[PDB]
């Protein structure tokens, strides 16, 4: 299968990005430095780690794959790759596997070094709950990153230049992290007669950063729908990216 | 229709029981004379040992925005030592008298009425002044309770 032969390229090309390795070092330091000030000062520190990994795992995903399609069109290899025995689906799905295992490794250096500072500096952490609360944390942090990876394929395939792709990747990162919940707060504190607050637990499902926190904070909905709603955010946006990539 | 259906549950007031703690002072409500306010919220009913302790709760800024119906007793149709549960008027459209020598539960004695002449009956019989719900503020509650249980 050629979905893996193009995946081994993106592993070797993504891991030599100095922009990515700078952020993954700062993510791994700040996950320890919050856990250091969360132990001396475990659900109380995994919520502050959830707000940390909502800042940077969309930022890591948009740093990797904002120039995945349009960066190859500017490089000229995109027109070359379509003349190979390769579909347009196998290029996108193979870049999604290759960029996916990068931030599936960036939480294993991110939270793999954070759990070392928790299991060895608390002395009574009751580690049987740790390997289920961090197994739920490391898996759901990749799925948060895989949404914004599929968001990055949507904005890369739409644009025609690399400079306006970074202008949209900053726009997607601002809108889905800290504009959607600030306009939820402004719809609370300024509107109450025409804003039903019972509707607001369902309006959090239109935001994958919000669905990320709800499966790290354990609510009218169960947990298993939020796992199926986070995976639905991958599956529509990848299918949306495949529909955009077929119109170049 | 959503606002009306939520109204269609909040409007009814629950009758007081012997095992009813106040929301603020937490002690048993029916061991006291005087009218007893309560607050129906439509997500959970909270009750108060006195009407002055209910109005002290209402003037806090957590509950200014809270759409919740306030219900007090009608002391124009009840004996003051043992108020029943039958007639429980809306607290916004009442006529509280102030400054009487009657012994309420927690705050100042605020006998609630609905007909304003029986409110004028108790005002001249004890030296008080009738006043509406919207004139009640926190400069008046602390002034009137200091004149009742002070000196």
């Amino acid at each position: 299968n050629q979905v893996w032969n193009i995946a081994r390229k993106e592993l070797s090309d993504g891991l030599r990005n100095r922009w990515l390795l700078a952020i993954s070092l700062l993510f791994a330091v700040l996950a320890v430095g919050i856990a250091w000030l969360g132990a001396a000062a475990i659900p109380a520190t995994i919520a502050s780690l959830a707000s940390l990994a909502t800042f940077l795992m969309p930022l890591i995903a948009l740093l990797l794959a904002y120039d995945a399609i349009v960066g190859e069109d500017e490089g000229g290899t995109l027109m070359l790759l379509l003349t190979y025995p390769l579909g347009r689906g196998q290029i996108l799905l193979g870049k999604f596997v290759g960029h996916g295992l990068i931030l599936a490794l960036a939480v294993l250096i991110g939270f793999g070094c954070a759990a070392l500072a928790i299991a060895l500096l608390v002395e009574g952490v009751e580690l049987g709950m740790l390997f289920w609360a961090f197994g739920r944390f490391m898996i759901s942090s990749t799925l948060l990153g895989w949404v914004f990876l599929a968001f990055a394929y949507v904005l890369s395939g739409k644009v025609n230049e690399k400079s306006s792709a970074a202008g949209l990747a900053l726009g997607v990162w601002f809108l889905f992290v800290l504009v959607f919940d600030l306009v939820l707060l402004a719809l609370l504190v300024l509107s109450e007669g025409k804003f039903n607050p019972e509707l607001l637990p369902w309006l959090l499902l239109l935001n994958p950063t919000d669905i990320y926190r709800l499966i790290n904070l354990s609510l009218p909905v169960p947990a298993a729908v939020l796992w199926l709603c986070l995976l639905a955010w991958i599956g529509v946006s990848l299918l949306l990216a495949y529909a955009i990539f077929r119109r170049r | 229709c959503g606002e009306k259906e939520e109204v269609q549950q909040s409007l009814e007031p629950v009758a007081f029981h012997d095992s009813d703690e106040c929301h603020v002072c937490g002690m048993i409500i029916t061991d006291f004379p005087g009218p007893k306010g309560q607050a129906v919220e439509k997500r959970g009913v909270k009750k108060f040992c006195s009407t002055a302790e209910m109005l002290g709760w209402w003037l806090q800024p957590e509950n200014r925005l809270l759409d919740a119906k306030l219900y007090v007793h009608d002391m124009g149709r009840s004996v003051w030592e043992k108020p029943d549960d039958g007639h429980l008027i809306d607290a916004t459209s009442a006529y509280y008298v102030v400054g009487t020598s009657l012994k309420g539960a927690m705050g100042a004695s605020l006998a609630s009425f609905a007909e304003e002449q029986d409110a004028k009956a108790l005002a001249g019989m004890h030296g008080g002044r009738v006043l509406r719900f919207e004139e009640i503020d926190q400069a008046l509650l602390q002034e009137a309770a200091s004149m009742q249980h002070g000196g």
Binding site: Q2, N5, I6, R8, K9, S12, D13, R16, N17, G75, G76, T77, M79, L80, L81, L82, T83, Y84, P85, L86 | -
Partner: protein, 308 residues
Amino acid sequence: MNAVEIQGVSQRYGSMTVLHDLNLNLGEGEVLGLFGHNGAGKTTSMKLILGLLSPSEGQVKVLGRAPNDPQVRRQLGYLPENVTFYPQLSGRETLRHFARLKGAALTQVDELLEQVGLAHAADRRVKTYSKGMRQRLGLAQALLGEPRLLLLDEPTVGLDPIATQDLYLLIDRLRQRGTSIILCSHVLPGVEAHINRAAILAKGCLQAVGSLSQLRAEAGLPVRIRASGISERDSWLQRWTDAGHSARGLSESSIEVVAVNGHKLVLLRQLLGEGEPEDIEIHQPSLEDLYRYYMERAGDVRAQEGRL
């Protein structure tokens, strides 16, 4: 057997036809040249040969199949112009990436890095490569496997003057084996020594197809004979002008003959018979001059004294 059989396609985008009535047949070992100026027909024809587009009013038969079969593209090299590969990857790892996709054997990567002369700069990043160093890498992925058709869109841009002539010696080694390739260049002297048959095309149509001996025969273009001191300038200016040829009156000791190549068979006997041929330069009408003629044959009024 013909590699590319473009059989009467007419490619349009909306109402405008960017490529109208193109009819090519590339042979089994021929080197063909797609040259275009006003039209975007050159670029669209490239896409039609590959699997990038579809013929909206015709059909293409690349290697006897449709151009988008996987059996076609495993034996089809394509070097695009101005390509810049993945700069954090190395030179060996980039070709090892491209060998995995085309299904070529991994024992051919170290051969083709040696074949294009990239052994010294292998295992270095593509960001620390020159422009012509990336053209050696871009040529090397086209030679992966056993290709039967190459589309070299501008292969010698930014390349060293030894390596361009070494590239065309690799071309004539390839076309002897039987892989008919296509040159797509814009520096017309240099491609003209190795092109088997030109395919100059205008805005819409295909202007002329055939070898250089057929283009010079059809388009009547005058020979550019320049000499230096055969007998004398003024004694030799007079002779070609009654026979119907232009004799340019230069400054001193130079005989420029622009003859019309129709009566000059027996006229050249007198030039040998009265003097020595020891310093002459006969220039045939070049591929640059033929291409400028076909732009004047359909469109494109000539620029001024020196304008464009």
